[PDB]
Amino acid sequence: GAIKTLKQKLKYGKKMKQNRPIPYWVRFKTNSKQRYNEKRRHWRRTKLKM
Amino acid sequence: EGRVGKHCGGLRVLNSYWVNADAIYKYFEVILVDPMHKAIRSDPEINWICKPRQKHREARGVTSAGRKHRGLRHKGHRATKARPSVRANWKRRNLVKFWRYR
Amino acid sequence: VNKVGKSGDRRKARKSYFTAPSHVRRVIMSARLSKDLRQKYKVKSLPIRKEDEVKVKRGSHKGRDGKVIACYRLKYAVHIDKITREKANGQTVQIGIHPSNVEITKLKLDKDRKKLLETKGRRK
Amino acid sequence: VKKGNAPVPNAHFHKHWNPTGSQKGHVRCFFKQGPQKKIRRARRQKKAAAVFPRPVKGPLRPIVHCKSQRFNMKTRLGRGFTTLELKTAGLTDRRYARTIGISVDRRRRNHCEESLALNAERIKTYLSKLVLFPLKAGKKLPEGVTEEDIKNPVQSKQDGFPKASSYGK
Amino acid sequence: RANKNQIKTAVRKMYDIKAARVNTLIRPDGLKKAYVKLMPDNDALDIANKIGIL
Amino acid sequence: PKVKAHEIRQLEKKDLLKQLDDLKTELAQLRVAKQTSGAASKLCKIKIVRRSIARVLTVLNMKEKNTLRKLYKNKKYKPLDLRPKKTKKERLALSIIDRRRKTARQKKILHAYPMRKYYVK
RNA sequence: ACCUGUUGUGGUGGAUGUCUUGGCCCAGGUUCUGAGGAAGGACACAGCAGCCUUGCGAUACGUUCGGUGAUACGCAGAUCUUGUGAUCUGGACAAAGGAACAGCUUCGAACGCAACUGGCCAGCAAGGGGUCCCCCCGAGCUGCCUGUGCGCCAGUGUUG
RNA sequence: GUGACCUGGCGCACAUGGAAUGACCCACCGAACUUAAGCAUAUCACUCAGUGGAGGAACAGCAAGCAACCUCGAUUGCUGCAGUAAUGGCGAAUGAACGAGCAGGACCCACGGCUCUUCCUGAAAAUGGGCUU
RNA sequence: CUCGAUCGGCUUUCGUUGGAAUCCAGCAAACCCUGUGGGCUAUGGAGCAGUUGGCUGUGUCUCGGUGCUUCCCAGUACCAAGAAGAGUCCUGGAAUGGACCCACGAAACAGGGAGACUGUCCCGUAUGGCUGAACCGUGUGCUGGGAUCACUGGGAUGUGGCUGGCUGUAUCCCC
RNA sequence: GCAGGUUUCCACACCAAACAGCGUUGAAUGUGGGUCAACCGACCGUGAGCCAAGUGGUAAGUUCACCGAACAACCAAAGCUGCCU
């Protein structure tokens, strides 16, 4: 709902920011780097505890 | 001694002594020393109390009453399994020692 | 017990080689001097540097020569004046060459480079 | 229990002596014996280099007969000389004896004249094999010391005397 | 952690413009957004062509 | 033309704060350009100006702490961050003077019997 | 055509062989945290960055300084070269000089009181700003136990 | 004349304490599975778990000790005593110590293995104290 | 502020050294006499009487050395780390492989890297150099000789102190 | 509109990666936006209840005891107000 705490809102915003796919230029980093973002949540799949 | 040392955490407990006893309680007086006082730190005879190894002697059984209940009043054949500690002694004589050649 | 630092442990040595920083890769990527330089300075090997000439002496480019234009210490590679190669498209790229293969034909001779030559040249 | 004639086991391993997943164990393995031999040797020679121009052990110990009836005849080293042995040797100051390297034991007394005479002559061959360096390097110099005993201070490994057991043997 | 008063003074110091009012959001990500309504004499467009918003 | 610590160490506080003000104004302009996206030569200057600001502030704070150490050098009850930064145990450590304190009997015996150097021939 | 089989081949599958910046084991040394704020936890911080980092804190993948001495690099972008000088590295870390020793949001022993609150728009207040007042911002101080000292006291406690 | 002490308090200043740490340590507390071919004293075990406190080590420590000897001479650790003496439904099982041989008896501890108090002396250990310099 | 002592993984800690500018005190700071401090430390002690030894700033005039710096003369040293990527040829994508006569190091054949199997390709290793820290060469450093300075031993003679042993006592010692 | 969800809201691109037991669509994917308060609410107290404090219990920390302005204690908790200064 609309009612939140400032702490909860900051945490939800950080989770929104983390919910992002890897930059494209990252795989090319010489020593073989990450291909995809394995830490990526979706509101349907997995819920935040909070 | 333990109660006084836990209540006064920044002091060091040297001896205590019985002062009184009634039906309900026994009363003791505990001598404590402030390790961060210039007089204490200056006088050599008590200067050993200011070293970090002397914290909570009441808690570790280093005071006279502790030495009493640890069996350390006596020595020799009347304090056989007492030193350097009851548990240290028990460990030392329950140890399975495996030399390189047996 | 063997003393510290002088250990022939394969795992430790390989860890050091593969996690060395750039100031250590500078000396791991050292190259041998030509006989001209070797007689002239009484020094046998130096760390390779941009702007100096090399002869490849090994690999599929043996007997070729050119000025070093890039020390790619991350890859332990060295790029040379004109040892190039076309990509799938016409873009010409550089071939990395481990500096142990090359020998050094000239030096750039900065101030610290000349001081290093002198300090290693004085026989002891 | 054996189906044979083997003795009664008497095994004595009923109390979690074994370092398993659940237990810490009561096992001490002495794999340090080899390295500790060399380490003890190294720290012993560091002791020598520290207290260099003196015996590596350092105090002269007396010779006392081992305690019981089983070891009566075996002699060994004591903790320090009795003040009677000191006074008989010529030393009336225990602290000075200690500072020049004779060990004192006021707990001990001489229950007989043999121990007294033996340790007295021990101290007397000491104090003659002994070269005292003078304080402050250039003042008075004692008797016997020849001004090159100070030039050549030699650290002997064992204290001149025979083995301790060589007095009952 | 900027207050509306802090934002008023900071705006008048960065760009010497009197703020008629300040309203403030904390936008979802966690940034704090501020609407700064200028006095009628001021012109947010004539100020934006200075600031670089165009 | 960026800020060099050896070049601004010679400056004085009133001349250094004006430089810091110019630097903060420039970084603000870079932050506006980051939104009104311009050139990479303007988007990569951000960290240059930011480290420049950092080192101007470093020179300021270092000069101030230096003069404060000059001030409270001889005084007792210095500021806690000007007192010598040892670990808590060795802040509370019994002094070497106090460890070497001795009773008068100790001193008189250590005088009357010095440990002497001696070897056995 | 279907089935069964045998070969050849192609798929599905990840066994094997070889190795390994990893573990496990033994020996040696040290044990070096914290109210001057620890260990942990948050929220931040990168031109293109989400994660990770014994990265870092509004000076925010880094600041001063030293050692080194031309890179770094996945793209670009201006700085940088016989040099105040790229990069990497060193506990913000060497100077033997009592010379030098920056900064460090926020909860946390967590310290003004609380807190599922960034609340009481806390009290006091150096200063800064808008106009004596007043208004806004505001460093800093205010935790408890215990010890010592200083100030003020309490008592039909003992006395003068 | 409106005090001097004693005993308590409040505020301030200067300080300790607090919390953390898959090894070791000190003090307590404290099981049961198990074994006994059952089970209850016994055993596991004066262990696991729990509480408190540390240090680089901790604890112990120059005898109100060992012994009965031709005595020894802090404590600790090892070898061994010794699976012995002894305890135990004298069942299952448990079970030391001294002698003796070593390491140690240099060092960041010592009045170089002691000392406080007792006891002797004694005008507080003697040209006031404090803040800055 | 000086003066001394103590510390160096360092930037101190302590002091009844003395001085100035000051403030409390006023029979004289404040704790403390319900005892701070000294003596002894039970195979001994204290007192007293007497002897025999040693440590110490020593007032004072003697002699030598070591060196903190500086100056001259002379010599030495200043740090790395060896040996074929040999003339060739062949195979190979790449020689560390193979063939031809001749080569060399080793106090280094521990290791690791490099386009495959290396003692002589690279880092390194053994050894060496440091560890007064300076790891440096129109600048230094060391040694030796010589000189100035900086500093401490040996003899005068009042001390200021101390302090060990030994003898005797009539005196006593309370854990 | 609550609790819960936590960007699913909106727009554009996009469905030949996969999901939606189809697929020019979507709560999918990618990008970029959007939530403005003196007046609506938390915040202010108080209720049931709880914590610190005070004191007590324990070998000892405690999720140990008491919450007592109806109602406690072993308790020196009125630090505020008017005038003078």
Side-chain angles (χ1 to χ4, degrees):
Chain A
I3 294 164
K4 289 158 190 51
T5 312
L6 181 74
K7 297 178 62 170
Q8 298 172 8
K9 171 142 171 188
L10 264 297
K11 294 223 177 53
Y12 288 132
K14 178 163 175 288
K15 287 303 177 302
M16 293 178 58
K17 281 184 285 207
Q18 289 179 295
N19 194 13
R20 179 203 185 281
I22 294 183
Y24 80 91
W25 54 265
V26 172
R27 323 172 177 173
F28 304 135
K29 297 173 65 183
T30 56
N31 221 8
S32 281
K33 196 71 199 308
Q34 306 172 357
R35 278 90 169 97
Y36 67 102
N37 195 333
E38 307 164 3
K39 279 168 203 162
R40 178 170 167 82
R41 43 160 299 270
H42 186 240
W43 61 288
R44 287 300 263 288
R45 311 201 191 99
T46 294
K47 300 309 202 166
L48 310 159
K49 284 182 183 176
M50 190 65 68
Chain B
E1 292 174 353
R3 275 168 193 177
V4 180
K6 174 66 59 52
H7 184 258
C8 300
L11 299 188
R12 306 262 159 99
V13 165
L14 69 87
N15 281 107
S16 194
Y17 55 97
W18 181 100
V19 297
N20 216 335
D22 62 22
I24 320 292
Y25 306 91
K26 269 181 191 170
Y27 301 94
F28 303 88
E29 274 183 22
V30 193
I31 316 178
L32 308 102
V33 175
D34 187 34
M36 303 307 161
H37 208 309
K38 68 184 307 303
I40 293 312
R41 298 169 68 85
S42 298
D43 191 82
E45 182 175 355
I46 193 62
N47 219 356
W48 53 270
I49 206 74
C50 309
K51 304 181 191 308
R53 80 170 83 179
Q54 297 304 331
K55 316 204 281 176
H56 294 283
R57 313 151 82 258
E58 87 277 345
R60 299 177 282 120
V62 183
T63 310
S64 195
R67 302 194 69 258
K68 167 61 177 171
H69 81 275
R70 291 161 70 197
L72 306 184
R73 270 304 178 269
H74 328 284
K75 51 176 67 173
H77 88 278
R78 288 211 290 146
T80 288
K81 314 182 191 214
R83 292 173 221 275
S85 175
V86 292
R87 277 173 291 280
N89 202 289
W90 179 83
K91 177 167 195 155
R92 191 256 307 153
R93 50 184 173 75
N94 280 82
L95 210 50
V96 186
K97 321 188 202 66
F98 284 114
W99 284 102
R100 275 189 318 161
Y101 293 84
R102 291 95 193 282
Chain C
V1 181
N2 180 18
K3 74 182 287 188
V4 53
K6 293 182 312 191
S7 171
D9 192 341
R10 173 170 181 84
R11 184 185 163 178
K12 299 183 189 170
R14 183 181 284 269
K15 174 73 166 291
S16 299
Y17 179 84
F18 287 133
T19 55
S22 72
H23 78 275
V24 185
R25 283 160 187 250
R26 177 188 151 279
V27 77
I28 288 183
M29 295 167 47
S30 66
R32 190 195 191 84
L33 264 52
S34 177
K35 288 194 177 65
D36 277 6
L37 275 60
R38 197 180 186 184
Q39 177 272 352
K40 179 183 182 317
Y41 298 112
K42 303 178 296 296
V43 63
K44 172 185 191 161
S45 307
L46 275 72
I48 211 169
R49 189 192 198 277
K50 187 177 53 191
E51 299 291 325
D52 58 28
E53 282 82 340
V54 293
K55 189 174 198 60
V56 184
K57 290 279 303 163
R58 271 312 172 278
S60 160
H61 297 278
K62 50 193 312 179
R64 280 185 66 131
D65 62 334
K67 187 196 69 90
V68 178
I69 68 174
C71 289
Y72 207 114
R73 299 182 191 165
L74 193 64
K75 295 172 174 189
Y76 285 105
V78 160
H79 301 173
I80 307 192
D81 196 341
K82 61 184 181 294
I83 300 196
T84 51
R85 187 186 190 282
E86 285 150 26
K87 215 190 285 186
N89 38 1
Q91 175 176 357
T92 47
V93 309
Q94 285 292 338
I95 297 94
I97 291 180
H98 194 266
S100 67
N101 305 340
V102 299
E103 87 172 357
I104 304 183
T105 299
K106 279 179 49 188
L107 264 62
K108 185 179 185 293
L109 296 189
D110 289 330
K111 166 180 272 192
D112 280 359
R113 173 56 66 90
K114 295 189 313 171
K115 201 170 176 176
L116 171 71
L117 283 183
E118 279 206 6
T119 305
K120 301 177 71 86
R122 48 193 59 160
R123 274 83 61 198
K124 219 192 275 207
Chain D
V1 307
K2 196 266 178 184
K3 317 177 68 167
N5 205 354
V8 168
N10 167 71
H12 270 90
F13 285 95
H14 286 78
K15 47 166 71 173
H16 294 189
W17 67 278
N18 187 73
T20 190
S22 46
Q23 301 302 327
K24 296 260 207 63
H26 303 343
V27 166
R28 194 181 309 285
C29 298
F30 292 110
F31 299 133
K32 66 183 179 66
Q33 177 185 5
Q36 285 296 325
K37 191 181 173 188
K38 291 184 47 173
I39 289 172
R40 269 194 312 272
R41 206 181 158 222
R43 74 175 50 155
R44 212 178 295 128
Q45 84 171 337
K46 210 163 185 301
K47 157 184 216 190
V51 52
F52 155 56
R54 304 188 185 76
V56 191
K57 301 190 171 30
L60 188 76
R61 312 274 160 166
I63 280 161
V64 309
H65 282 246
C66 290
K67 265 167 87 160
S68 181
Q69 172 259 325
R70 166 166 184 177
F71 314 98
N72 272 336
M73 68 301 289
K74 315 298 216 156
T75 60
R76 56 163 170 102
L77 291 190
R79 200 205 202 264
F81 294 96
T82 65
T83 180
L84 183 48
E85 285 153 16
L86 258 56
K87 189 185 68 65
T88 318
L91 300 167
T92 68
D93 197 354
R94 41 167 276 259
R95 297 202 151 112
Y96 172 79
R98 193 56 193 84
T99 53
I100 74 176
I102 291 166
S103 65
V104 182
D105 199 36
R106 288 172 292 165
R107 292 196 277 272
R108 214 167 66 76
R109 77 159 152 110
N110 311 101
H111 309 65
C112 68
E113 196 278 347
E114 281 77 357
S115 71
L116 177 54
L118 175 68
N119 298 288
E121 60 92 21
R122 199 164 157 86
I123 300 163
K124 288 208 206 67
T125 68
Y126 204 80
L127 275 174
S128 65
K129 272 75 177 168
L130 176 69
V131 166
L132 286 172
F133 286 63
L135 280 175
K136 207 151 61 64
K139 305 196 311 308
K140 302 180 181 70
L141 188 147
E143 297 295 331
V145 189
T146 185
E147 186 72 27
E148 62 263 11
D149 300 320
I150 298 180
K151 303 307 163 291
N152 263 266
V154 299
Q155 186 176 58
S156 61
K157 301 292 99 178
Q158 192 172 4
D159 55 346
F161 292 93
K163 198 194 181 331
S165 303
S166 176
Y167 295 70
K169 280 164 196 161
Chain E
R1 303 224 198 166
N3 296 343
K4 306 193 181 176
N5 305 315
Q6 308 209 55
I7 290 156
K8 271 188 170 190
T9 76
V11 160
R12 191 168 148 191
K13 281 175 191 304
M14 285 267 260
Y15 328 101
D16 39 359
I17 66 190
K18 291 216 171 203
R21 191 204 37 190
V22 180
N23 297 341
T24 61
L25 296 74
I26 292 188
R27 37 185 286 159
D29 44 355
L31 308 188
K32 193 149 165 177
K33 185 160 81 187
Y35 300 84
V36 196
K37 175 196 196 163
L38 306 190
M39 290 291 212
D41 62 358
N42 290 351
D43 202 47
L45 201 68
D46 293 331
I47 301 300
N49 67 9
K50 271 87 187 170
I51 301 178
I53 318 180
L54 269 43
Chain F
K2 80 166 170 57
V3 188
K4 305 154 91 69
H6 66 89
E7 276 180 353
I8 56 163
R9 257 190 206 102
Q10 305 160 302
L11 263 50
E12 56 90 19
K13 186 183 175 199
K14 184 264 291 181
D15 193 6
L16 209 46
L17 298 154
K18 183 252 175 186
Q19 188 141 7
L20 180 60
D21 202 336
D22 291 333
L23 281 192
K24 261 161 187 166
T25 302
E26 186 177 357
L27 174 59
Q29 292 176 12
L30 301 161
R31 275 181 301 180
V32 184
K34 182 154 161 38
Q35 320 298 331
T36 59
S37 309
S41 315
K42 285 174 95 164
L43 264 291
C44 297
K45 202 152 176 170
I46 298 172
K47 81 193 298 181
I48 281 170
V49 182
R50 215 166 59 235
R51 313 280 168 78
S52 296
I53 294 176
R55 74 189 66 180
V56 169
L57 281 169
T58 305
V59 170
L60 285 170
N61 291 355
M62 282 182 82
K63 192 43 185 171
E64 184 174 2
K65 295 295 288 293
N66 213 50
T67 188
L68 291 179
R69 290 193 193 267
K70 307 294 181 46
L71 201 76
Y72 298 83
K73 180 69 148 185
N74 295 130
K75 286 196 192 68
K76 61 182 70 176
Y77 297 132
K78 299 185 215 191
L80 277 191
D81 68 334
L82 273 68
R83 292 173 192 190
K85 183 55 175 203
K86 299 170 247 289
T87 53
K88 176 181 188 155
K89 191 166 84 170
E90 58 190 1
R91 283 194 254 120
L92 272 65
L94 204 157
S95 177
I96 185 59
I97 289 283
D98 298 9
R99 282 180 290 171
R100 284 218 201 89
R101 287 269 158 74
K102 283 161 195 312
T103 70
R105 169 177 179 98
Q106 279 175 309
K107 281 181 291 285
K108 292 200 193 82
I109 288 158
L110 288 168
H111 203 80
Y113 307 102
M115 280 301 251
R116 308 206 47 203
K117 184 198 288 197
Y118 63 96
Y119 84 97
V120 166
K121 65 165 54 156

